[PDB]
Write a protein that binds this ligand. Structure first.
Ligand SMILES: CCn1cnc2c(Nc3cccc(Cl)c3)nc(N[C@@H]3CCCC[C@@H]3N)nc21
Lengths: 261, 296
């Protein structure tokens, strides 16, 4: 009943549909005159830090990122205001998803008084207007937790390693903006399964999703490379986070040298 | 937008905001306005209601028509409905509600609830004050202030949920997780209430509520509900009341109604009937949609 057997299939179908409607414009960053993929990389890494400081759910982070990409898909923003957008997004996400959201005043504190409370609250309203209140977006995590139900024997290092890889994809718009949440989550699940147990993407998820190892190959290649290059990446907050016992220190596990794909 | 609406009268106060009846001057449409005043920005209560109700279009869920964002206030424009079920039950206190109407309203509430659960949404406050009815014979789920989008499987959500009288045993006993079953419990308490015109478990505290439920359905043990003996707020010193016949719990109800109600009030959330399966139950064999019997 906690896995809602009577409804999980209707819910998966619904999320596949919404995934397409909540998609950011794939090539939004070139039409932004003052900001770059490098600057958004810095911002997402900062949000991961904020999430660990205030002990927020991982879903909260994934949602915030979705709100940011959609807002920037239609609104030009100067480099000096990118942090104000990102802070409002995290406030909106916490209000939606958290049992105990932090107060507005703590969202002002974590910006080092770069912005006023009046500014944060007004940016909240503008983000709502731009998104037309469509805040219940599907995320990588929403698919991943469903996929986890198809394990022979459930395995905690598999689950935490898929979460970590999914989270890594949030930092790099190029090229993860061209892949849908359900696909990135499928690549991350297969890659975690293989790395830990040597197993592959099961026939039961071929049946649920329609996705095969061949249709996942493109995203699965980019994600392999991201995993390999992670100790060298300019932003390290996710690797640091997944050292914790809470996530079974999975960022210490060595990636495989090759895929067999 | 706001200059086309003419306020008619106040209706009353909800979970949050205040509700008015009003008229669209150009179009003729009668609507219900929920006014929310703008401390902390936009309340999470409204963020959830607005986002979830925009996604949910069904004939047994109240329709959200527009959001008017005047930066000093927020106005929610809704289809107008003539009464709630609670008030209608008082208007039928002597006389009763005819059985074909109870059957119709239970059937429609299950359709609406099945639709919520298929779209990843938990109501959380299903009671007769939150169920709205019209002249043509419809009933609709309303008030999504306490609602919440869930994941599969569910995580730990807020504990301080559902009005006391309609609150499921798994919430009362402090379980880590609750799911869709919580809304079915409430709907079962309501079905009994339509038949009887008085609440089925009217407790005055968390512990009295629990004791009233155990007195009617039996104190649960490990055979009827595996795990109950280990729940955080279970106490070995609870009294062990015997379970009474359901023919005594709701005396006027036929054999089919009793079957359905027992299945909706099952102790174990894993065995409790789903809204989707309840639509196929023999109770609804002959169902229709008559108009209410009194004026609204
Ligand atoms: C916002 C969606 N909505 C549409 N129509 C609504 C409504 N209708 C009426 C009209 C006249 C009497 C009554 Cl009890 C309800 N009441 C209503 N809420 C009131 C608020 C407190 C009094 C009881 C009822 N739940 N909400 C309604």
């Amino acid at each position: 009943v906690n896995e809602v057997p009577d409804y999980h299939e209707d819910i998966h179908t619904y999320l596949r549909e919404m995934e397409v409607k909540c998609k950011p414009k794939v090539g939004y960053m070139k039409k932004q005159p003052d900001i770059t993929n490098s600057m958004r990389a810095i911002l997402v890494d900062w949000l991961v830090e904020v999430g660990e400081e205030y002990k927020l759910q991982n879903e909260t982070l994934h949602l915030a990122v979705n709100y940011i990409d959609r807002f920037l898909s239609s609104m030009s923003v100067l480099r000096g205001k990118l942090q104000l957008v990102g802070t409002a997004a995290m406030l909106l996400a916490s209000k939606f998803e958290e049992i105990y959201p932090p107060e507005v005043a703590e969202f002002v504190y974590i910006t080092d008084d770069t912005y006023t409370k009046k500014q944060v609250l007004r940016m909240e309203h503008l983000v709502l207007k731009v998104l037309a209140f469509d805040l219940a977006a599907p995320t990588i995590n929403q698919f991943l937790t469903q996929y986890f139900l198809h394990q022979q024997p459930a395995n905690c290092k598999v689950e935490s390693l898929a979460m970590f890889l999914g989270e890594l994809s949030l930092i790099d718009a190029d090229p993860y903006l061209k892949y849908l949440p359900s696909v990135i989550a499928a690549a991350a699940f297969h890659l975690a399964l293989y790395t830990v147990t040597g197993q592959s993407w099961p026939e039961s998820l071929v049946q649920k999703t329609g996705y095969t190892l061949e249709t996942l190959k493109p995203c699965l290649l980019d994600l392999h490379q991201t995993y390999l290059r992670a100790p060298q990446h300019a932003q390290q907050s996710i690797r640091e986070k997944y050292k914790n016992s809470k996530y079974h220190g999975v960022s210490l596990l060595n990636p495989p040298e090759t895929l067999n794909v | 937008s706001m200059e086309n609406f003419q306020k008619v009268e106040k209706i009353g106060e909800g979970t949050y905001g205040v509700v008015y009846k009003a008229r669209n001057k150009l179009t003729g449409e009668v609507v219900a306005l929920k006014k929310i005043r703008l401390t902390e920005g936009v309340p999470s209560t409204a963020i959830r209601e607005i986002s979830l109700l925009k996604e949910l279009n069904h004939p047994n869920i109240v329709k959200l028509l527009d959001v008017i964002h005047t930066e000093n206030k927020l106005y929610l424009v809704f289809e107008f409905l003539h009464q709630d079920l609670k008030k209608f039950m008082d208007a039928s206190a002597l006389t009763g509600i005819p059985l074909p109407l109870i059957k119709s309203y239970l059937f429609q509430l299950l359709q609406g609830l099945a639709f919520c659960h298929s779209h990843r949404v938990l109501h959380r406050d299903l009671k007769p004050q939150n169920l709205l009815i019209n002249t043509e014979g419809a009933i609709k789920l309303a008030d999504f202030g306490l609602a919440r989008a869930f994941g599969v499987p569910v995580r730990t959500y807020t504990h301080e949920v559902v009005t006391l009288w309609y609150r499921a045993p798994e919430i009362l006993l402090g379980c880590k997780y609750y799911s869709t079953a919580v809304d079915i419990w409430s709907l079962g308490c309501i079905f009994a209430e339509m038949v009887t015109r008085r609440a089925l478990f009217p407790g005055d505290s968390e512990i009295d509520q629990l004791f009233r439920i155990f007195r009617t359905l039996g104190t649960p043990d490990e055979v009827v509900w595996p795990g109950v003996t280990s729940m955080p707020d279970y106490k070995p010193s609870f009294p062990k009341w015997a379970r009474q016949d359901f023919s005594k719990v709701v005396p006027p109800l036929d054999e089919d109604g009793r079957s359905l109600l027992s299945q909706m009030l099952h102790y174990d959330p894993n065995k409790r009937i789903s809204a989707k399966a309840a639509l196929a139950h023999p109770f609804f064999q002959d169902v229709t949609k008559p108009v209410p019997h009194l004026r609204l």
